[PDB]
Design a protein around this ligand. Structure first.
Ligand code: ANP
Ligand code: ANP
Ligand code: MG
Ligand code: MG
Ligand code: MG
Ligand code: MG
Lengths: 281, 281
């Protein structure tokens, strides 16, 4: 039916960072979880769905289960910093890049790129391939916050940590009234495709990078390679199924995402991929 | 004489967090330090000086060393997450307090206290005494950024992590031109006491807490117990010693502190401490 975490054993000797909603440690089927709570003045859903799409993409993602916790809908992310594994995020790494007078929190794309090539945790080709793999995923999903504290490495010395924190994908602000507006108006819809959301990663002019523009204009062989690579792993029939099998989501929402994913896939990915394909030899 | 870190062996497999500038892991004297660089739109001094003052108050603090790399002036912090020790900040810990539907990054004082009473990493009373300890030293050093991410615990389970990131203390935005301006204009010296810095922490109404006002009107026995506890360790000669003995510091700057420290010492600490005593009986 639907999971319920309410009674599972909490682990009180563990906490989690991040500035959106609380989270606690707890066992489920003999495994530990980080259980994100929603904030309130709907990213629990983005987090579950987005990740499951990333999985279907053959990329290493955190396991995610919708469930209830004391009358609050909750996303449970399997915990990958157990068994004596520690997470160091990219931020902390970029902070070692002292020859750039810019701080690790900074998301200017070129610097981020530079640090990848200059870091010594992971073979820079592996790391660079991952990064763009992730950027494509993020493109499809509309991740508006893949900052340097939203990916990283596990140490026991290092390996890439599974993609996490996709709570910022797929329109977390959208509610049934918004889903409604957009679905009934191509103009609105378009604004949520070309203009916004934008990547948290910046150009050398300090603007957030535009998903559509960037991807349909890049000559970065690394970004282009990763398109040609992930494009085939994309399976709309599955992605829609992930959406259909989302546990609490209203129906109106469910079809907002259906539409939105088809559109993103078609007006950004398809297009960019198609050009990507055309640049060979 | 003075220390050049410039040629010391760097550890290309550890990084560090924080928004304010780069840092790298290197061996000095056979040991890891975290070496913090200055951002360039002065804090390396604040850190060094502030930690040596904290130490002299008898509190457990990171050891600081002031050196040069490549003509940079840089502060070295003895790394305390070597030997399997993993640092975990209060913020994550506060993030688990799901009952207050506020996040683990918000610095509302009451919420913070609640988390102290209700967390299972440290015996609560001990931590309530630490927090308060630190608050007092911050009052002395004038810390405007003691955020839940700026203190925490250590584990291989928990012990309190030595006070770190005190680099936001002791007027870091002030330069030789500012020091002069303050050193002359009394009205200017006044407000860097009665007006700011203010603590990052907050009251129920959202406003940040005024060091002076709070310190001299509060009936929180735990804050006051802290005052009485700490006051007798304030060694004004040793402190001015610490200022005179600072390695690259300019003299106008050296004295800006001397002044500024006497000022906070007598204008807040003394006054508040006096009221404390009289408080019993
Ligand atoms: N599956 C996981 N296992 C262990 N630690 C995790 C996991 N997922 C996240 N974390 C850690 O917990 C912190 C909070 O998780 P995260 O999903 O990033 O929360 P968030 O509030 O969405 N982060 P953000 O929005 O970028 O400030 C992350 O920064 C990681 O350090
Ligand atoms: N002595 C130490 N040993 C090991 N780790 C440390 C040490 N000091 C600080 N750290 C860690 O590395 C980070 C260093 O940043 P720190 O200098 O403490 O604050 P900052 O760089 O000013 N950023 P912030 O406090 O977020 O505004 C801290 O957040 C800790 O996680
Ligand atoms: Mg995060
Ligand atoms: Mg997020
Ligand atoms: Mg810090
Ligand atoms: Mg600081």
């Amino acid at each position: 039916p639907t999971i319920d975490f309410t009674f599972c054993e909490i682990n009180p000797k563990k906490g989690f960072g991040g500035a959106n909603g609380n989270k606690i440690s707890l066992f489920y089927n003999n495994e530990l979880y980080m259980v994100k709570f929603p904030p309130k003045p709907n990213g629990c859903f983005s987090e579950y769905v987005a990740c499951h799409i990333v999985n279907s993409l053959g990329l290493k993602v955190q396991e995610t289960l919708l469930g209830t916790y004391k009358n609050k809908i909750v996303v449970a992310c399997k915990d990958f910093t157990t068994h004596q594994y520690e997470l160091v995020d990219f931020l902390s790494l970029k902070n070692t890049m002292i020859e750039l007078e810019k701080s690790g929190k900074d998301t200017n794309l070129n610097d981020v790129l530079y640090a990848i090539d200059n870091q010594h945790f992971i073979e820079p080709k592996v790391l660079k391939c991952f990064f763009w793999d992730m950027f494509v995923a993020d493109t499809l999903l509309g991740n508006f916050d893949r900052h340097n504290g939203n990916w990283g490495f596990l140490r026991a010395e290092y390996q890439i940590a599974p993609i996490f924190d996709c709570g910022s994908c797929l329109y977390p602000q959208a509610d049934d009234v918004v889903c409604q507006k957009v679905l009934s108006n191509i103009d609105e819809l378009n604004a949520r495709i070309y203009n916004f959301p934008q990547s948290i990663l910046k150009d050398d002019n300090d603007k957030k990078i535009n998903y559509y523009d960037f991807l349909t204009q890049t000559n970065n062989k690394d970004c282009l390679d990763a398109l040609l690579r992930i494009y085939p792993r994309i399976d709309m029939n599955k992605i829609h199924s992930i959406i259909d099998n989302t546990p609490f989501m209203s129906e109106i929402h469910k079809e907002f995402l259906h539409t939105m994913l088809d559109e993103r896939k078609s007006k950004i990915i398809d297009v960019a991929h198609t050009r990507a394909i055309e640049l060979s030899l």
